[PDB]
């Protein structure tokens, strides 16, 4: 099991650099710091931390959960580090597959035209603002709702 002591097992979840890479980068003491790190879950989203991050002995499985239209880092503050620490730092949440669904058809909505007309971004960015995040963008092709958080 991983040199840095990192744990990422959930199927679909991955990292940038890959765990495999990350291992090489980890030092002779199990320690492992990496700049511009990314933890993602194919098809759901990904969180990106720019700059140095200390993955040392981090059990990502337990810590980061990336679900549809919703990401959560550090479930309950049982092991949640002080801000600026671990993954509790600032990051760029990216939530894929985000789209609204009309009450009638209940068949989602992907028409960039339909979205644009209903101003989905608007609402999205609205929420992000309320949650204390800085709306970054919205890629309708892939229902990607990217936004920055200060901490988690």
């Amino acid at each position: 099991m991983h040199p840095a002591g990192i744990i990422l097992t959930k199927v679909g979840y991955y990292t940038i650099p890959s765990m495999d890479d990350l291992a090489k980068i980890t030092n002779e003491k199990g320690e492992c710091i990496v700049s511009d790190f990314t933890i993602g879950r194919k098809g759901y989203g990904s969180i990106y931390f720019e700059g140095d991050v200390n993955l040392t002995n981090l059990n990502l499985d337990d810590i980061v959960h990336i679900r549809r239209k919703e990401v959560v880092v550090y479930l309950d503050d049982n092991q949640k580090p002080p801000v600026g620490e671990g993954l509790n730092r600032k990051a760029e949440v990216t939530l894929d597959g985000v789209w609204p669904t009309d009450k009638t058809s209940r068949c989602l909505i992907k028409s960039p035209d339909r979205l644009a007309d209903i101003n989905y971004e608007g609402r999205l960015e609205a929420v992000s603002r309320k949650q204390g995040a800085q709306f970054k963008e919205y890629r309708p092709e892939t229902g990607s709702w990217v936004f920055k958080v200060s901490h988690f």
Partner: peptide, 6 residues
């Protein structure tokens, strides 16, 4: 927690 709670 960060997401759309629709």
């Amino acid at each position: 927690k960060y997401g759309l709670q629709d």
